[model samples]
Target: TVEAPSVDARAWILMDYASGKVLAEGNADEKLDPASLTKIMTSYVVGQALKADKIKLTDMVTVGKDAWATGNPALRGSSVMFLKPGDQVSVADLNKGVIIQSGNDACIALADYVAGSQESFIGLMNGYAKKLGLTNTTFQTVHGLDAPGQFSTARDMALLGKALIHDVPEEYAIHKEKEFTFNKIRQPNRNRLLWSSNLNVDGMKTGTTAGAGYNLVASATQGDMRLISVVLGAKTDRIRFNESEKLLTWGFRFFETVTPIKPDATFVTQRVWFGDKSEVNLGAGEAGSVTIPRGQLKNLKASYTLTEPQLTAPLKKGQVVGTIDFQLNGKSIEQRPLIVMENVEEGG
Candidate 1:
């Protein structure tokens, strides 16, 4: 009997997706070979491409000699659709390969087609990783192959996964797929959590390799709270899924979502510089919520701190001018940026 091995992942993390709070973690900052899990970032960059209109679902891609030479066979690892050099497949098909099949060949082909070369696309990958504030991640290849310098931490992968879903909602929907078909080939998504009855696992990615063990970045929502979990370097595939499930289950069990700012709540008013409007009302763009242990709302305290130097003229609506800190038990737990709700033009 496999007595659920005590959390043995080399690196693990569980975060509240809405509030960005760390619920539980171990070695989250430690660098580790992300193995095929590197595909999470690949999916991230590809989603960006879709959002930017650089590629369309109907657009077709012609396979290259390199893709065919290096592509793996059915399901041993990830591959989009098996493509022989010169075979034409749609951008949508490539997406299925990456998301549903974890197709390395499809990733290389898409990278080369979109950014001109695999090497150049990798540059964009690194640049986007930096923009997302993924300090612990470095991408040497788009396909999450076991490259010497290619690596990421559990925290970084979770951040990347969260950014993709939040920043690109339409494209992010692709990850929810159970299966997709292209070129008469049908592939099933490897993320078992999507099929698990216990988890509300909506969308995410999975990766594996000899060096990286098994890795998963998964997300789930219960009530108003959403959680992101990262498990890296688990000894086996079962361990990776079990660890992620346990982490997410624990998070949902322990945390409650509390609203610090109500919807349409007024925050502040900033003077305008020269626009027709004299001032802009700063308020919560969306209702703001924080995750805390259940029954701790009354004890939670919040403090506001505006950026130094005060307001200046010509401040744009929705411009962030300060932050609100939520403290609990005398310790800071959550902070949210405060932005102007209405437009502020140049002074009259």
Candidate 2:
């Protein structure tokens, strides 16, 4: 019931990471140039490879001509970690180059090494975009320089920001590092929110170009909740930072996320009419959380209604049996399926 704060960007979104709630947004679904915010996907693909052990942080990558800041036209005037061809950079340091330094050269080097070519790596990026339900996103380059098909929406960027942290926190941690030193050159992170004294901002990205303007995807944590804000198409670098801060502050000030049902935690035992065990355990199949106005937790209640009148026999594990509801002050606020956690066989 809280009104969202005003934002001064073309498109922006504030989302709670736990409940996946959009606290506030403006033109959130409109596809717009993402600029270097595209690095979030580049880093995400590489991080997923690392998580699967396909690539090691210690592994060294050989820089190619295409990844050199001097030889590449698109990278000209773009940020870089000062990479040179034939240079042997560790996967770990290259990640810093991409995240902390916003290094276009670092993104190409990692993409080249991970998927054998930049084009192939871009395919992986788009593949993941599809899998993550980023309907309005597309990638035409590895470094996020303006290309014809390269576009992303604020809502999609927020989803990517959350997934980058949720799916590979080990690599997402690199986003918070203030500075990165490599090849005798050091550069500071472009995200200014990390330096805020009042907010616990950490780990995210920023983007800028003549076409895209100034953009930022910032994540912050307060108390037990973490929120992400995406601000795009701002007139100035300072405005992107300020607008993002305003969104995050508004989200934290008015709303709170609560986990009413733990994932896979048993909620009830129901009688089975024709099962050998005579009963079965049912629970929430996944983590269930709700984001509501602050001080409303005391009014929250959990309840369930069985979809089937009675369990009639063999029930497979993870089968949906009922719907779980989260009610606040007698009004249903959220709903998810109640699932069978244990298989029950037909009675002999």
Report the C-alpha lDDT of model 2 over 176-223, residue by residue, as the tens digit. 999978877778998889999879999699888666579999999999
Best by TM-score: 2
RMSD of each: 4.3, 2.0
For model 1 the TM-score comes to 0.86
Candidate number of the best lDDT: 2
* Candidate 2 runs further than 4 Å off: 272-277, 312-317, 343-348
Q: Model 2: number of clashes?
A: 0
Tens digit per residue, CA lDDT, model 1, 142-247:
7877678877898998898888778876656788799987767668888999987887898788877566588888988899888899898888989989898988
lDDT for 91 in candidate 2 is: 94
lDDT against the true structure, per candidate, is 0.78, 0.89
The per-residue C-alpha lDDT of model 2 at residue 166 equals: 95
lDDT of 2 at 206: 88
